[PDB]
Design a protein around this ligand. Sequence first.
Ligand code: NA
Length: 129
Amino acid sequence: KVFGRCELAAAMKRHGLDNYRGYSLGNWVCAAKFESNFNTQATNRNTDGSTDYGILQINSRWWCNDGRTPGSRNLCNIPCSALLSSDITASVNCAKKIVSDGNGMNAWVAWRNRCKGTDVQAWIRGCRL
Ligand code: NA
């Protein structure tokens, strides 16, 4: 599924991500924009041989199991394929654990490089939330 911006904002808000660990909804929508372009089916191979899955490009190195990431963890206890679903419940549940790990949203390099410090509320502008 390719989400609309306000459609994804609503879905994220509904699932308790707005101000989760102090991160406004605009931060999460900005991260999703530059990680996935709001595409639930997005996969990207990392140099280390791990893969990033779904709207928030969650890494198989730590968070999900893809069976092809030697020496990796599955801390969200989910198949990585569960992170490509049109229903964002599993990506959100797993993202709550990532953002809670100590470095907040810096875990998402695209968030740090492209969202952090910027006018993130622009990402929810005009949305009926
Ligand atoms: Na893994």
